[PDB]
């Protein structure tokens, strides 16, 4: 596709690769620093509001957000039917992370000088401890679309 | 708006305008590309046509008008 | 304190040239500083190929690395004699303080 | 410039060449 999967250096605070990916999703204009800060501050936000350790909260969020099945269009003899299909494990992560950041940006709450609260709140809302929020919606909606046209 | 201590005015029209001064004035116009020039009193009463770039517009210059540029009198852009 | 600047396109043309000057002056002055290298700077110039004239439209990119060599000679005397007639290689442009 | 007299754009230093063109031309051979 775009290119071969490049391996990402694990996170400085918690040496989790998945985290860095998330951070990359947040960052824009290569402002890697602001991006890391927002995620870290959110993690701190996750600590206070929620007793649980942030790393666990985030991972659980991504799980709720990953779509198992997605619908892809295809041209049949008549009309382009939307064929439902599985999603690559690689694909699911990129979608989940992307959707979180997008929904997070979606939130009204403008907290912290930046975005940092929206990420914090979004992740918790995602958790399935709380499996709500805009991110999960998209995920649920896609799956629903699939198997509709089973 | 003060450009500098000495008001600039290109010599093409100045030298030309002033010569007209001793005879009197010059009937008919003058025509100069030098919209850049500021107008001085000797200019007054005269009718200098300025260059739109398209054409030269007759501009009678009166006293209230002196400090100005002359170009200010000939508009480059037309709604047409 | 005669500072000598030797510049050239070819690294060898200087090594030869500047080296000669070292040996000669050894005869009538102090003992030279020894050919000091002075790093080579490369210049990239993007310009009109010709000077104002034909083909202003033209361009082109050039890179010309130029080499330097000082070898200073303090306490001068009949250094000048041994130096003046003695030079060799073209391809070298030497200027002295 | 000096040689060709193309005014359009001669480098001062050479102050020669038709312009860049002759500069490049002379340089070329």
């Amino acid at each position: 596709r775009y290119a071969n999967k490049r391996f990402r250096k694990a996170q400085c605070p918690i040496i989790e690769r998945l985290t860095n990916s998330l951070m990359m999703n947040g960052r824009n204009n290569g402002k890697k620093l602001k991006a890391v800060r927002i995620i870290k501050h959110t993690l701190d936000i996750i600590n206070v509001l929620t007793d649980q350790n942030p790393i666990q909260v985030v991972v659980d969020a991504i799980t709720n957000t990953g779509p198992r099945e997605d619908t892809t269009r295809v041209g049949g003899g008549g009309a382009a039917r939307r064929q439902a299909v599985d999603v690559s494990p690689l694909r699911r992560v990129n979608q989940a992370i992307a959707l979180l950041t997008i929904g997070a940006r979606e939130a009204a709450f403008r907290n912290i000088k930046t975005i940092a609260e929206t990420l914090a709140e979004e992740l918790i809302n995602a958790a399935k401890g709380s499996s709500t929020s805009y991110a999960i919606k998209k995920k649920d909606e896609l799956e629903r679309v699939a198997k509709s046209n089973r | 708006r003060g450009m500098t201590s000495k008001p600039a005015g290109f010599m093409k029209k100045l030298r030309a305008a002033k010569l007209a001064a001793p005879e009197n004035e010059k009937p008919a116009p003058v025509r100069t590309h030098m919209r850049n020039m500021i107008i001085v009193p000797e200019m007054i009463g005269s009718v200098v046509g300025i260059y739109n770039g398209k054409a030269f517009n007759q501009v009678e210059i009166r006293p209230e008008m002196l400090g100005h540029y002359l170009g200010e009198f000939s508009i480059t852009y037309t709604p047409v | 304190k005669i500072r000598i600047t030797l510049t050239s396109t070819k690294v060898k043309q200087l090594e030869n040239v500047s080296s000669n000057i070292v040996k000669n002056a050894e005869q009538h002055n102090l003992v030279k500083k020894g050919p000091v290298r002075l790093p080579t700077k490369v210049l990239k110039i993007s310009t009109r190929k010709t000077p104002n004239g034909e083909g202003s439209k033209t361009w082109e990119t050039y890179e010309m690395r130029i080499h330097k060599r000082y070898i200073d000679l303090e306490a001068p005397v009949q250094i000048v004699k041994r130096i003046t007639q003695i030079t060799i290689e073209p391809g070298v442009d030497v200027e002295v303080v | 410039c000096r040689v060709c007299s193309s005014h359009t754009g001669l480098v001062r230093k050479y102050d020669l060449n038709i312009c860049r063109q002759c500069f490049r031309e002379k340089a070329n051979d």
């Binding site: - | - | 073209p90 442009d93 | 000096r2 040689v3 001062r12 230093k13 050479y14 102050d15 020669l16 051979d29």
Partner: protein, 188 residues
């Protein structure tokens, strides 16, 4: 040279070359190297017929060299005038080109003139050679002519070809026709 008069110093060289090409044509100009220090420039014109340049007992070399001084005053500084013979004019692309350019002026069959030149060049030394004629062949519709022998291949590719190149023009009643001569020699 000097920042101030590198250009000035340069203009003179063109000035010198200007006269030499005009005069020395019969001699067979190949190249005019110009080396310089202060008021003493080298200028060593290379020629096929050194005789034509020198003159008898060196009479012409005197006039030309003197002419040079008029153009090169003390400020330009007196200049010398060395002349070296071109070993085998047949090797000089410039000459080979000029050679063909002349015949064309005569109105010789261009294609043949080309063959001959490649042959001469090919004939004495030269690992490879190629000649190109512009258009308006025989005052005809513009065309192009070729001809080549030996490996110009392994040349053209920049890697140390040592291919002499030369172009010669040809004014004609019909029009100008450029000539290109490529000669391949042992590479580096």
């Amino acid at each position: 040279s000097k920042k101030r008069k590198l250009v000035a110093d340069g203009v003179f060289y063109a000035e010198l070359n200007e006269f030499f090409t005009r005069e020395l044509a019969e001699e067979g100009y190949s190249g005019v190297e110009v080396r310089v220090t202060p008021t003493k420039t080298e200028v060593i014109i290379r020629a096929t017929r050194t005789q034509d340049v020198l003159g008898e007992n060196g009479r012409r070399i005197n006039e030309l060299t003197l002419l040079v001084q008029k153009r090169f005053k003390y400020a330009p500084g007196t200049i010398v005038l060395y002349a070296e013979r071109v070993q085998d004019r047949g090797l000089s692309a410039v000459a080979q080109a000029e050679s063909m350019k002349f015949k064309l002026l005569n109105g010789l069959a261009i294609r043949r003139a080309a063959y001959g030149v490649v042959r001469y060049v090919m004939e004495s030394g030269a690992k490879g050679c190629e000649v190109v004629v512009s258009g308006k062949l025989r005052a005809a519709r513009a065309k192009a002519m070729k001809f080549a022998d030996g490996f110009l291949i392994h040349s053209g590719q920049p890697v140390n070809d040592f291919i002499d190149t030369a172009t010669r023009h040809v004014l004609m009643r019909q029009g100008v026709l450029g000539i290109k001569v490529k000669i391949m020699r042992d590479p580096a």
